[PDB]
Subunit: 233 residues, 4 copies
């Protein structure tokens, strides 16, 4: 009865994780397009920048495909949980199914953060190299140093925002992963009662971490979106 | 009995590791709170920083939840060790439990160091963008460069302190992780006698590393706390 | 027939996607190792009497040998993967052995690819760091600070552009590797008919999107060749 | 018959290659920990009243202890690996049990090695960052900015060359580790006679390329010792 109770609370918590993960992925990929536009306008004749754009588009395709799989695996996990509660299938198959949906989602999420991180850092590096060339050329060094300082200030604020999103979900992914690891060690009734108290508290805090992560995702949207418009201008 | 002898010292070593890991997590998360305060004060109208603050609190929740699991798994590990010493259960079940408790804690510990590192780097990056804006604005560039230089000195030494704590326990985690793998390969009596000498010396060096890590934990609180006050000041 | 046919259909398209991935991975490694050769020459010319620079050259050549050796393995495993997939379609072998074989060929190659991008990045970052230390030493010595800062700014612009190009190549295949790894993970969880009907739609779309990612990566690889090769010539001059 | 001879032949050459890796990795670890001692002293001399620096020193001493423990385990497992290989040749034990032992000894050794490279790299980066904070504070204070800016450039030049040297060591063995890891993965997939015949060609070539990487790595280890040691004494003076 305790095992069936834990599997339900874990399954519900994992469902909440995929929702937040999907919201993040949709918004991060939206920011990436606008970021890629700013980068092209900043350096339109660079084959290196063009390679990054093609590479970023390819990575974006893989992220979308990977989450579609994660949603389907969650559905297979739902059935396996019911059957594990009904005693038809070994509960370990349900844990591996829940683990699969969890790991696939976070994997796609972490790649989205990395592509956006590298893109914002690319804009910063390209801008630093463009203005510095004008400063040393005497093309109004006073105005160039100001735009350089402003641009770096805008990219830094966006990089800090994206890093907050990763740390938000990484904490939730860490808690849920520890819960699944406890269930794999607690195979008998004796073990399950030892971890039951810790696991129940972990599932609640994991959902709290998702809440703070969802809040962080919203602020990251406003932060990066506004900063990308000032850069475009 | 020789296998039971190693399993006893190994269980003790993992218990000491979990003790140091908890103190580290307790102190690192405490420094994070003050670090988040300094970051907000540096740029109070930045939504990017706000996203990180929410994200950092969310990550902190996951670290506490993940460590609660590590405590429970250690208790389950203790019973499986007793049964392995008494011959009721295969020692492999005890090793799988010890590895889980060990890996879960270090995962939460390594994440705590990462969140704090990112926060200190944010304080450094935000200050660099604030002072540079004042230097270029003519608001006493001599004095601003002095505050800028001091701030970078304060953030840099704090990053060195956190890095010492992470490397301390990572060394201990490496030794214990190698011991568990050796016991899993040496299943027969012949194999166990070959690794016994290497394992016993490893247990001593691993505990010495945990002690050296605790010392680093002590210095890190005093160092970072003082440095964070000067930045706030 | 109603369900063993859907399994055979997915395993074939998956094998095709892995085949395209393995081809792109080989092309990437071939050119990245070529750019590394040109980069090591520029690095030696930048600091020819440094034992630190020489140590990296020795280390970089050793890593290149491991990348070439690792990819020869990845192609052979693909052949073993082909046999196990066909036998799984014919019901001769459990489908997990075919999935586990595909993972080996996939993971081993991408590992060699990941190292090629990393070694090239470290070399390009070394060229930038060595040049920064050479020009700054000349600027502080009064050896025409205006011209040195111009070369310093140009050099940093050229090294940065090459690092951005390499980063685009890695992210291109990483997206494809992400999709295919998720596809295999779904097939390993969906062993029965009921689960397989749920993931079939997502898997079919994923294999197409994965093939698009491989194409977008190949384009990035070609653009990276022209950019980095040309930039390395300007640095040598 | 002939397939068991091919398997026994590959397992022997693999064991030889893995044995060379652990020895070369051990020599590197011995030298890296020796350079780490000198590096911790240079950092201490640069900032003797910083508890942050002291915390890193204590942490580095602990990490150094863990690396030695991990390497002692890796040699013992290598001995167990040799016996399991002999038993697999005689057909007494499943070859998969021997592969997990070889992989274990391989993974345990490289883990300690990669940590050693990180600790030294982090220590060298700390010396560079601490020096930047010492000279810049003096430059802004008017304490002879001409001499301070030169010392700042000289220190960064010495730290950068050492970081390039250490990076050559990491890439050297990681390339060898990549080849050996790919070989072990191929043997676990090629269980039947047909599969073993496919990987024989790739594995035999890989073992030669893997040993070539070890040779180029050993050269890098020798050059890295002289480079980093020489740079560390100039800073001490």
């Amino acid at each position: 009865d305790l095992r069936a109770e834990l599997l339900k609370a874990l399954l519900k918590a994992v469902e909440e994780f995929l929702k937040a993960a999907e919201e993040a992925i949709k918004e991060l990929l939206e920011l990436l397009k606008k970021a890629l536009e700013v980068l092209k306008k900043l350096d339109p004749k660079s084959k290196g920048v063009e390679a990054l754009v093609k590479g970023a588009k390819g990575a974006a395709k893989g992220i979308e495909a990977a989450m579609k799989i994660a949603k389907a695996v969650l559905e297979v996990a739902k059935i396996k949980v019911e059957k594990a509660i009904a005693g038809e299938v070994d509960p370990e198959e349900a844990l591996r199914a829940l683990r699969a949906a969890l790991e696939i989602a976070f994997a796609a999420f972490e790649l989205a953060c990395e592509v956006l991180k590298k893109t914002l850092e690319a804009i910063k590096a390209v801008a630093d190299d463009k203005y510095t060339a004008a400063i040393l050329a005497g093309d109004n060094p006073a105005a160039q140093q100001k735009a350089l300082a402003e641009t770096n200030a805008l990219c830094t604020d966006s990089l800090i925002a994206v890093e907050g999103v990763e740390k938000g979900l990484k904490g939730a992914y860490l808690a849920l992963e520890a819960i699944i690891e406890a269930l794999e060690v607690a195979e008998d009734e004796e073990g399950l009662k030892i971890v039951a108290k810790a696991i129940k508290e972990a599932i609640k805090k994991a959902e709290e971490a998702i809440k703070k992560a969802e809040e962080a995702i919203k602020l990251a949207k406003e932060s990066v979106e506004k900063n990308l418009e000032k850069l475009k201008a």
